[PDB]
Design a protein around this ligand. Structure first.
Ligand SMILES: O=C(O)c1ccc(NS(=O)(=O)c2ccc(N3C(=O)c4ccccc4C3=O)cc2)cc1
Ligand SMILES: O=C(O)c1ccc(NS(=O)(=O)c2ccc(N3C(=O)c4ccccc4C3=O)cc2)cc1
Ligand SMILES: *C(=O)CCCCCCCCCCCCC
Ligand SMILES: *C(=O)CCCCCCCCCCCCC
Ligand SMILES: *C(=O)CCCCCCCCCCCCC
Lengths: 269, 55, 252, 237, 237, 55, 55, 59
């Protein structure tokens, strides 16, 4: 981790650690004792908060969807990506290739909707969240045969309990997920660009298992991703521009930095 | 089959794994190995400070 | 002494009198694929000295106002030699590179270039609900150029090229985490980077994925006084390293 | 069964917690690893890498490459200033979007030494000397060369070897300093002056540039994760 | 009692979970086992068994036994195609309802080699030769015999021994391929041509058939369970 | 009376049985023995590849 | 990795730490060391009772 | 090289085996044996022409 400062006295020598050539593409290994007289300091500081498995291993909200126990929008569909929401996305894009296991956690809430229904009296709601791996049947309605879940992972959750959670393995067909792809999936080099199937990891469906009330209730499910067991390769400059789309790297040109008055001024504007 | 490891301090704790999948285990927090020499000093020739970088 | 260098690959030899060392990747030198990392079960083709040798690309003038240039690596050598004739007959291949950029000028000239090899440099589009076409990203040994002003948004399949965002939406001054050297005209006249194969798969098709992009970007413009040479070229030379190919089929 | 009792914090979702949870896909074997070049295991690996500093950034300079360039020229006398900016990465306009500075808007605290490198990009007939100074805080910025040579400084002579390093020592009352602006954990001021004029012969440009780089030393550390102020959204993408 | 704390995922029903639960009938002794022939312990046992492939399946052929039959005949010249279908079991019309293909609509990923066998079912006076080819993807299907002999191929000569195996190597960028259609994990194309004409004497039929079989090799594996798209219902039966 | 067994990896876990019936135990996930030779090669005579199947 | 310590009485208890941070541990209740001699008697010369404080 | 000591440049010194005529472009000539010559201190460079012949001797 952090290294200890070593004491140094006066010099007058043919050594020149301060002078260097930065054209070589090498970062100089100069320490403070080289350029000045220092005392010996014992350092007890650590670099344990800046591990990759600390930086990326906190739950982050990626998406939220709504669905109702009446009318249209009886269920919610979402294709799992960590690219809908800015904050998690930016952190993963300090790297080109990442490999991790997910832990999904769901915060499901319900809100009574305005109506003129007399004598509402909800029963407790039970919700079903169904993970469907790539390919295979997709529910086209609440009350299809796809919600049987004979071989699709699924959880059921009654209100007023702890959030559900489940672990997902590393599901890539590649040896790492890629956050950037500089190519086309077609051999003609036509169609969509930057689209790849290394990051597929199914679709998520959510519904009510009962309409408890005679009146309308609308639920909101929020999905949290927590990377764990992380490994990362090839670091990249942070994103400077705001994101526009979830499938593209497209951007509006942004200035390098914010301005200031002069090149000698000691304040920001 | 318990592991006993040291805690982060300025003691020890006990952990048992309960599941048959190794993707169910808690996150690895205490791995502190590092090597900045891939990204700093990627040069073929060995640079010695206190000697010219270019002769 | 430390400034003289010679690199021999196949027929080719490069010699420089001013050299800033050689940068090697992420401290990994090119190697052949192991049998404990391989997936494909056929015997590789390894042409050796018919693929792994220096190829010069077209030169491009450095002017007092020039914004920069880029070349996408497997598709800038795709029409050249038997390197280009092994990647259209095979479905797979993997290779590293040695990139050597030359640019010589007098001791009365000044300027500075940044030479970077950027893994998977995916580049934005001027119009925000389209992606670029393959005729705006890929040259073929001709360099594509950046712009100094934003590309206007039409109904475009154009690339958003601005030097200061590097066409990727990042600060251009932070491209120094990628393997790099500077050509500063008062010091050195050449730069050498040796890239290893970087991908998340052991081999990949090379006619629809570009896994590296070379960019040469002026940070300090070219300047000289009247009476000096007004034409200063920048030549790029690229050699494959440990090329393999697998999955022999028909041409296309 | 076994008599148990629940404590405060049961049935909560803490976002920083580490607990075990069953897999939704049991007995799933993951694809083998391959060695990919350039594995990262710490972010202080990649904060120790030089990154071009946009010292200039005055009006319309941030929308060009002129931000990174620092003017120097042949002028009458010497002891005129070249630049000045305050030490406070992850706050200052100059340092907030550098590679060092963006691994430091995810943290509340920072400690250790920082090294600036300078690279002279004139012609090979140009020559000069500079005074690269750093003043601890408590007396404001130096406004003369003679005020600035009472702090830490290095005199840089340009010849073969076209770079020089000003390493900024850690001189602080506290063990850590805030990333965000506070006057209790003020950093000091970094200034540059002509020690000697830029001297050129005929037919060589008398205007030259300097480029600046910044990286952390090996005694550097960061602490206490937080959201960065530099990414936003109004709706899902 | 013992202080405990509940974590997220308590009081949930995950359908993939393995936990112990009390029996509703305690001390119930089950009937003895007997050895019954043909115990199955893995489904890759029964994916390594040959299964007739319905190569033909053009209009009204699927409602007959003509689906399984592949026409070959005596014709002028040679180098004409006999069949072509793409490599992609568990998607393709040809392979989705084969025995291999239906242990592969329960899985998302697949890897390994596949072996096609062909059985000539002409008369014993008929003779001929075929070119059984496989082309990796990246150049489209071969449209001539000379385009198809640049890929993997076997020349099959018919005599005693009336079958020949074209083993399809694993040649893929990735370690696994998707079961479902994706162009990133394209499989290639399998084609057949006349290397030599079918030659018969008088009083023997000049029209013959070939039957095709498919099975997995011993390096084959599948991964990631999912519901099959091939069974449906509108109400309970 | 705990069993300690290896997890599925690209460590170990602990399990105790709590009930007196062996139909209450968790599912057996880690049994990987197989024998495809009943369904492939059920022939009485031994087939050798690299020799005619029929003489 | 259990600690066994004595209880406050006019027996023993068992404690296991469950977390990887040492700021998650229960409060230290049983530390009874003390030294009032910093705040009482801070004088340089040693005072002896049964002798004049000032000669 | 017999320029002044301020002159600098680079050259491609190529040799092509026979069977395709003389190269007529720089890109045709870099497919043969070649050396890139950089002028600095050391004002000479050697292009050694290998023996590549079907026969052991040539007329
Ligand atoms: O609270 C958070 O966890 C949460 C809140 C905001 C957020 N990101 S945001 O870009 O600010 C954002 C802000 C609002 C909405 N949004 C709505 O508020 C809403 C209401 C009704 C239908 C659809 C939507 C919907 O897309 C979506 C995203 C992420 C998470
Ligand atoms: O959700 C699932 O778990 C679930 C949903 C559908 C399902 N199979 S189905 O064939 O699609 C099916 C679809 C509908 C009904 N069904 C009704 O919806 C219903 C309403 C009222 C009375 C009787 C019934 C009844 O038989 C039964 C079966 C199985 C389980
Ligand atoms: C090694 O694992 C044996 C050490 C003693 C184990 C105590 C176990 C604690 C209670 C059971 C946890 C079981 C999780 C499935
Ligand atoms: C062997 O079983 C003894 C090993 C230690 C057992 C720890 C038991 C954990 C708590 C009791 C589980 C009892 C289930 C009825
Ligand atoms: C030393 O710690 C081993 C002594 C026996 C441990 C019994 C553990 C009790 C149950 C597990 C507590 C685990 C907390 C993460």
């Amino acid at each position: 981790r952090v290294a200890d400062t070593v004491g140094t006295g006066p010099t007058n020598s043919e050594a020149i650690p301060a002078l260097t050539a930065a054209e070589t593409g090498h970062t100089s290994q100069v320490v403070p004792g080289d350029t000045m007289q220092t005392r010996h300091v014992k350092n007890y500081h650590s670099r344990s908060e800046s591990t990759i498995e600390n930086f990326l291993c906190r739950s982050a909200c990626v998406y939220f969807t709504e669905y109702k126990n009446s009318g249209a929008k009886r269920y919610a569909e979402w294709v799992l990506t960590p690219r809908q929401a800015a904050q998690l996305r930016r952190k993963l894009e300090f790297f080109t290739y990442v490999r991790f296991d997910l832990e999904l956690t769901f915060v499901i809430t319900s809100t009574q909707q305005p109506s003129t229904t007399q004598n509402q009296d909800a029963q407790i709601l039970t919700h079903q969240i169904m993970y469907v791996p790539p390919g295979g049947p997709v529910p086209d309605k609440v009350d299809s045969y796809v919600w049987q879940t004979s071989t699709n992972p699924s959880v059921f959750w009654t209100e007023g309990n702890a959030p559900p959670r489940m672990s997902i393995p590393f599901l890539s067909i590649g040896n790492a997920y890629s956050n950037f792809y500089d190519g086309w999936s077609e051999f003609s080099r036509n169609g969509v660009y930057g689209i790849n199937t290394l990051n597929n990891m199914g679709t998520l469906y959510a519904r009510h298992v009962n309409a408890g009330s005679t009146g309308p209730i609308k639920s909101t499910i929020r999905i949290y991703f927590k990377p764990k067991h992380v490994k990362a390769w090839i670091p990249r400059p942070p994103r400077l521009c705001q994101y526009e789309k979830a499938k593209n790297v497209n951007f509006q040109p942004s200035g390098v930095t914010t301005t200031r008055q002069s090149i000698t001024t000691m304040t920001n504007t | 089959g318990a592991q006993v490891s040291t805690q982060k301090t300025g003691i020890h704790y006990t952990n048992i794994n309960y599941y048959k999948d190794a993707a169910s285990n808690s996150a690895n927090r205490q791995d502190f190995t590092q090597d900045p020499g891939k990204f700093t000093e990627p040069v073929k020739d060995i640079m010695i400070k206190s000697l010219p970088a270019l002769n | 002494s430390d400034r003289a260098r010679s690199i021999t690959l196949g027929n080719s030899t490069i010699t420089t009198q001013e050299c800033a060392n050689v940068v090697v990747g992420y401290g990994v030198w090119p190697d052949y694929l192991k049998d404990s990392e391989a997936t494909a079960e056929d015997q590789p083709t390894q042409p050796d000295v018919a693929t792994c040798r220096f190829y010069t690309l077209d030169s491009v003038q450095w002017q007092k106002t020039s914004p920069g240039w880029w070349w996408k690596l497997p598709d800038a050598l795709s029409n050249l030699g038997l390197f280009g004739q092994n990647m259209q007959y095979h479905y797979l291949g993997r290779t590293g590179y040695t990139v050597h950029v030359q640019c010589n000028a007098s001791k009365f000239h000044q300027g500075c270039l940044l030479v970077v090899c950027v893994p998977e440099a995916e580049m934005g589009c001027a119009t925000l609900d389209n992606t670029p076409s393959s005729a705006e990203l890929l040259g073929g040994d001709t360099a594509k150029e950046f712009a100094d002003k934003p590309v206007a948004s039409g109904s475009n399949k154009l690339v958003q090229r601005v030097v200061y965002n590097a066409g990727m939406g990042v600060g251009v001054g932070n491209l120094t985490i990628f393997p790099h050297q500077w050509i500063n005209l008062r010091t050195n006249n050449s730069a050498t980077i040796v890239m290893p194969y970087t991908n998340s798969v052991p081999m990949d098709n090379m006619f629809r994925h570009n896994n590296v992009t070379l960019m040469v970007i002026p940070f300090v413009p070219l300047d000289y006084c009247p009476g000096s040479t007004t034409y200063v070229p920048i030549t790029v030379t690229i050699a494959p390293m440990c090329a393999e190919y697998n999955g022999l089929r028909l041409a296309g | 069964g076994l008599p148990t009792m629940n404590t405060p914090g049961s049935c909560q979702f803490l976002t920083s917690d580490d607990f075990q949870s069953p897999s939704a896909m049991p007995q799933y074997d993951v694809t083998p690893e391959m060695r990919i070049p350039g594995e990262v295991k710490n972010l202080m690996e990649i904060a120790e890498v030089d990154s071009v500093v946009p010292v200039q950034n005055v009006g319309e300079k941030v929308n060009s490459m002129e931000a990174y360039q620092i003017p120097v020229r042949s002028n009458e006398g010497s002891g005129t200033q070249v630049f000045g900016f305050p030490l406070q990465p992850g706050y200052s306009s100059v340092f907030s979007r550098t590679l060092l500075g963006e691994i430091l808007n995810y943290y509340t605290h920072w400690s250790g030494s920082i090294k600036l490198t300078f690279m002279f990009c004139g012609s090979a007939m140009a020559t000069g000397k500079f005074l690269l100074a750093y003043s601890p805080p408590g007396a404001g910025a130096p406004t003369k060369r003679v005020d600035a040579m009472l702090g830490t400084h290095v005199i840089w002579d340009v010849g073969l070897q076209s770079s020089c390093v000003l390493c900024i020592p850690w001189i602080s009352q506290t063990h850590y300093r805030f990333v965000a602006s506070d006057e209790y954990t003020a950093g000091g001021f970094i200034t540059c002056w002509y020690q000697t004029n830029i001297v050129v012969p005929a037919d060589a440009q008398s205007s030259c540039y300097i480029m600046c780089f910044v990286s952390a030393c090996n005694d550097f550390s960061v602490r206490l994760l937080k959201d960065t102020p530099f990414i936003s959204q109004q709706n899902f993408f």
